[PDB]
Design an enzyme around this catalytic site. Structure first.
Site, PDB file in Angstrom:
ATOM      1  N   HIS A   1       0.827  -1.223   0.000  1.00 36.94           N
ATOM      2  CA  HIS A   1       0.000   0.000   0.000  1.00 36.94           C
ATOM      3  C   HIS A   1       0.856   1.266   0.000  1.00 36.94           C
ATOM      4  O   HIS A   1       0.596   2.188  -0.816  1.00 36.94           O
ATOM      5  CB  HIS A   1      -0.960  -0.071   1.199  1.00 36.94           C
ATOM      6  CG  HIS A   1      -1.915   1.061   1.163  1.00 36.94           C
ATOM      7  ND1 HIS A   1      -2.705   1.306   0.053  1.00 36.94           N
ATOM      8  CD2 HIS A   1      -2.175   2.026   2.053  1.00 36.94           C
ATOM      9  CE1 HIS A   1      -3.447   2.361   0.296  1.00 36.94           C
ATOM     10  NE2 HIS A   1      -3.142   2.811   1.496  1.00 36.94           N
ATOM     11  N   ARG A   2       1.778   1.391   0.927  1.00 39.81           N
ATOM     12  CA  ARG A   2       2.535   2.641   1.120  1.00 39.81           C
ATOM     13  C   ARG A   2       3.819   2.271   1.855  1.00 39.81           C
ATOM     14  O   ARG A   2       3.816   1.384   2.734  1.00 39.81           O
ATOM     15  CB  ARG A   2       1.650   3.651   1.868  1.00 39.81           C
ATOM     16  CG  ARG A   2       2.247   5.041   1.955  1.00 39.81           C
ATOM     17  CD  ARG A   2       1.148   6.048   2.255  1.00 39.81           C
ATOM     18  NE  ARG A   2       0.139   6.108   1.209  1.00 39.81           N
ATOM     19  CZ  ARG A   2      -1.154   5.841   1.344  1.00 39.81           C
ATOM     20  NH1 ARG A   2      -1.687   5.497   2.510  1.00 39.81           N
ATOM     21  NH2 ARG A   2      -1.943   5.933   0.283  1.00 39.81           N
TER      22      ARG A   2
ATOM     23  N   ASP B   1      -8.222   0.174   5.895  1.00 44.41           N
ATOM     24  CA  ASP B   1      -9.082   1.101   5.152  1.00 44.41           C
ATOM     25  C   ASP B   1      -9.636   2.233   6.015  1.00 44.41           C
ATOM     26  O   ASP B   1      -9.470   3.402   5.653  1.00 44.41           O
ATOM     27  CB  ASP B   1     -10.257   0.352   4.532  1.00 44.41           C
ATOM     28  CG  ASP B   1      -9.839  -0.832   3.726  1.00 44.41           C
ATOM     29  OD1 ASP B   1      -8.980  -0.640   2.799  1.00 44.41           O
ATOM     30  OD2 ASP B   1     -10.403  -1.924   3.998  1.00 44.41           O
TER      31      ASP B   1
ATOM     32  N   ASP C   1     -10.075   5.005   8.778  1.00 35.62           N
ATOM     33  CA  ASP C   1      -9.090   5.958   9.304  1.00 35.62           C
ATOM     34  C   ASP C   1      -9.829   6.924  10.223  1.00 35.62           C
ATOM     35  O   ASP C   1     -11.022   7.171  10.019  1.00 35.62           O
ATOM     36  CB  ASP C   1      -8.320   6.661   8.194  1.00 35.62           C
ATOM     37  CG  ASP C   1      -7.321   5.722   7.490  1.00 35.62           C
ATOM     38  OD1 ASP C   1      -6.313   5.373   8.106  1.00 35.62           O
ATOM     39  OD2 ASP C   1      -7.490   5.468   6.344  1.00 35.62           O
TER      40      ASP C   1
ATOM     41  N   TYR D   1      -3.626  11.359  12.639  1.00 37.31           N
ATOM     42  CA  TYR D   1      -4.230  10.504  11.600  1.00 37.31           C
ATOM     43  C   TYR D   1      -4.044   9.082  12.077  1.00 37.31           C
ATOM     44  O   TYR D   1      -2.892   8.701  12.271  1.00 37.31           O
ATOM     45  CB  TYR D   1      -3.619  10.715  10.214  1.00 37.31           C
ATOM     46  CG  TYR D   1      -4.020  12.003   9.530  1.00 37.31           C
ATOM     47  CD1 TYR D   1      -3.318  13.173   9.758  1.00 37.31           C
ATOM     48  CD2 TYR D   1      -5.064  12.040   8.625  1.00 37.31           C
ATOM     49  CE1 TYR D   1      -3.671  14.364   9.136  1.00 37.31           C
ATOM     50  CE2 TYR D   1      -5.423  13.219   7.991  1.00 37.31           C
ATOM     51  CZ  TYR D   1      -4.721  14.375   8.238  1.00 37.31           C
ATOM     52  OH  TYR D   1      -5.125  15.498   7.573  1.00 37.31           O
TER      53      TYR D   1
ATOM     54  N   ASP E   1      -2.956  -2.303   6.322  1.00 36.38           N
ATOM     55  CA  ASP E   1      -3.904  -1.184   6.372  1.00 36.38           C
ATOM     56  C   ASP E   1      -5.322  -1.695   6.090  1.00 36.38           C
ATOM     57  O   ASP E   1      -5.523  -2.306   5.012  1.00 36.38           O
ATOM     58  CB  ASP E   1      -3.455  -0.139   5.363  1.00 36.38           C
ATOM     59  CG  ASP E   1      -4.406   1.061   5.343  1.00 36.38           C
ATOM     60  OD1 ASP E   1      -5.550   0.901   4.812  1.00 36.38           O
ATOM     61  OD2 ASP E   1      -4.002   2.112   5.909  1.00 36.38           O
TER      62      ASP E   1
ATOM     63  N   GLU F   1     -14.638   3.020   1.466  1.00 35.52           N
ATOM     64  CA  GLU F   1     -13.417   2.297   1.073  1.00 35.52           C
ATOM     65  C   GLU F   1     -13.460   0.916   1.752  1.00 35.52           C
ATOM     66  O   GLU F   1     -13.157  -0.094   1.138  1.00 35.52           O
ATOM     67  CB  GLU F   1     -12.154   3.054   1.496  1.00 35.52           C
ATOM     68  CG  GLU F   1     -10.884   2.312   1.136  1.00 35.52           C
ATOM     69  CD  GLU F   1      -9.541   2.959   1.443  1.00 35.52           C
ATOM     70  OE1 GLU F   1      -8.630   2.883   0.587  1.00 35.52           O
ATOM     71  OE2 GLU F   1      -9.370   3.431   2.535  1.00 35.52           O
TER      72      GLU F   1
ATOM     73  N   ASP G   1     -13.699   6.805   5.577  1.00 37.56           N
ATOM     74  CA  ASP G   1     -13.432   5.678   4.647  1.00 37.56           C
ATOM     75  C   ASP G   1     -14.289   4.456   4.948  1.00 37.56           C
ATOM     76  O   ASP G   1     -13.893   3.339   4.594  1.00 37.56           O
ATOM     77  CB  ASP G   1     -11.925   5.402   4.574  1.00 37.56           C
ATOM     78  CG  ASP G   1     -11.132   6.474   3.851  1.00 37.56           C
ATOM     79  OD1 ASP G   1     -11.756   7.451   3.349  1.00 37.56           O
ATOM     80  OD2 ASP G   1      -9.903   6.366   3.834  1.00 37.56           O
TER      81      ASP G   1
ATOM     82  N   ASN H   1      -4.638   5.010  11.568  1.00 34.37           N
ATOM     83  CA  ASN H   1      -4.985   3.888  10.680  1.00 34.37           C
ATOM     84  C   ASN H   1      -5.660   2.808  11.500  1.00 34.37           C
ATOM     85  O   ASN H   1      -5.031   2.374  12.447  1.00 34.37           O
ATOM     86  CB  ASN H   1      -3.775   3.177  10.057  1.00 34.37           C
ATOM     87  CG  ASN H   1      -3.068   4.023   9.034  1.00 34.37           C
ATOM     88  OD1 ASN H   1      -3.633   4.392   7.993  1.00 34.37           O
ATOM     89  ND2 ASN H   1      -1.805   4.370   9.302  1.00 34.37           N
TER      90      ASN H   1
HETATM   91  N1  LIG Z   1       4.097   6.795   8.773  1.00 35.77           N
HETATM   92  C1  LIG Z   1       3.845   8.083   8.529  1.00 35.77           C
HETATM   93  N2  LIG Z   1       4.856   8.966   8.684  1.00 35.77           N
HETATM   94  C2  LIG Z   1       4.606  10.276   8.484  1.00 35.77           C
HETATM   95  N3  LIG Z   1       3.474  10.867   8.127  1.00 35.77           N
HETATM   96  C3  LIG Z   1       2.498   9.965   7.953  1.00 35.77           C
HETATM   97  C4  LIG Z   1       2.597   8.598   8.120  1.00 35.77           C
HETATM   98  N4  LIG Z   1       1.379   7.995   7.848  1.00 35.77           N
HETATM   99  C5  LIG Z   1       0.585   8.989   7.533  1.00 35.77           C
HETATM  100  N5  LIG Z   1       1.193  10.210   7.596  1.00 35.77           N
HETATM  101  C6  LIG Z   1       0.538  11.482   7.324  1.00 35.77           C
HETATM  102  O1  LIG Z   1      -0.809  11.365   7.723  1.00 35.77           O
HETATM  103  C7  LIG Z   1      -1.701  11.907   6.707  1.00 35.77           C
HETATM  104  C8  LIG Z   1      -2.560  10.798   6.138  1.00 35.77           C
HETATM  105  O2  LIG Z   1      -1.730   9.656   5.785  1.00 35.77           O
HETATM  106  P1  LIG Z   1      -2.023   8.953   4.374  1.00 35.77           P
HETATM  107  O3  LIG Z   1      -0.718   8.550   3.744  1.00 35.77           O
HETATM  108  O4  LIG Z   1      -2.996   9.828   3.638  1.00 35.77           O
HETATM  109  O5  LIG Z   1      -2.797   7.659   4.814  1.00 35.77           O
HETATM  110  P2  LIG Z   1      -4.203   6.970   4.671  1.00 35.77           P
HETATM  111  O6  LIG Z   1      -5.119   7.953   5.369  1.00 35.77           O
HETATM  112  O7  LIG Z   1      -4.175   5.610   5.236  1.00 35.77           O
HETATM  113  O8  LIG Z   1      -4.658   6.951   3.114  1.00 35.77           O
HETATM  114  P3  LIG Z   1      -5.622   6.056   2.356  1.00 35.77           P
HETATM  115  O9  LIG Z   1      -6.990   6.121   3.048  1.00 35.77           O
HETATM  116  O10 LIG Z   1      -4.964   4.725   2.481  1.00 35.77           O
HETATM  117  S1  LIG Z   1      -5.544   6.712   0.476  1.00 35.77           S
HETATM  118  C9  LIG Z   1      -0.768  12.633   5.736  1.00 35.77           C
HETATM  119  O11 LIG Z   1      -0.475  13.938   6.230  1.00 35.77           O
HETATM  120  C10 LIG Z   1       0.499  11.802   5.833  1.00 35.77           C
HETATM  121  O12 LIG Z   1       1.666  12.490   5.458  1.00 35.77           O
HETATM  122 CA   LIG Z   2      -8.385   4.822   4.163  1.00 25.17          CA
HETATM  123 CA   LIG Z   3      -5.260   4.112   6.505  1.00 25.06          CA
END
Ligand SMILES: Nc1ncnc2c1ncn2[C@@H]1O[C@H](COP(=O)(O)OP(=O)(O)OP(O)(O)=S)[C@@H](O)[C@H]1O
Ligand SMILES: [Ca+2]
Ligand SMILES: [Ca+2]
Length: 174
Positions: free
Chosen positions: A21-22, A104, A106, A84, A102, A122, A119, A86
């Protein structure tokens, strides 16, 4: 398998189907125990599932737990602390990376304490597409409720003293 203080680790997030995923390239370890990993990162490379990259714009403290199905990112923006969160498998750590799935859902927390569960759409789509077992659905919904209670109680990474201690500790080591 427990990361050491001052270690720079990669964090790798996966979907339930095994696809990456990331990926976050660089997080400095502030605390490593059998149950909890706290790190800080700043201007880390982020890689998405299509390989596309971007660099974070601001520091973060990250909180991982081995016994809860969530992890927490604490962001320092101009008008205060954003979280934020997860919904996720608990983490495992090996020489490659700290790793989790992950799931989904959040939760975003604003500086004024307001939280929003994000989400649900999602989650519904992926739970059908990737056939999440019933017990994962139960555990994730339980952990949404636990995480909302931690936010309301200012427990764990939501404690103002947690932010003071670890933000200062990361400023010093970086
Ligand atoms: N491990 C991390 N280290 C630093 N910043 C993070 C980390 N995880 C998330 N962030 C920050 O938190 C916010 C949301 O993280 P995202 O990468 O958008 O994750 P996400 O919300 O799980 O996205 P989806 O729903 O999978 S598209 C953004 O500002 C990111 O930069
Ligand atoms: Ca999500
Ligand atoms: Ca997430």
């Amino acid at each position: 398998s427990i990361p050491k203080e001052g270690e720079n680790i990669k964090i790798q997030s996966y979907k339930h189907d095994g696809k990456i995923h990331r990926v976050w390239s660089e997080t400095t370890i502030l605390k490593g125990t059998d149950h909890v990993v706290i790190g800080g990162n700043d201007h880390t490379l982020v890689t998405e599932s299509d390989g596309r990259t971007w660099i974070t714009r601001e520091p973060a403290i990250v909180y991982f737990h081995s016994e809860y199905w969530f992890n927490v990112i604490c962001m320092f923006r101009e008008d205060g602390i954003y979280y934020y969160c997860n919904l996720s498998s608990p983490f495992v750590c090996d020489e490659e990376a700290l790793k989790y799935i992950d799931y989904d859902l959040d939760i975003k927390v604003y500086p004024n304490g307001k939280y929003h569960l994000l989400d649900e759409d999602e989650y519904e789509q992926h739970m059908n597409q990737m056939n999440y077992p019933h017990d994962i659905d139960i555990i994730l919904r339980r952990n949404v409720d636990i995480l909302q209670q931690w936010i309301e109680q200012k427990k764990g990474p939501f404690a103002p003293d947690f932010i003071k201690v670890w933000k200062e500790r990361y400023k010093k080591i970086r």
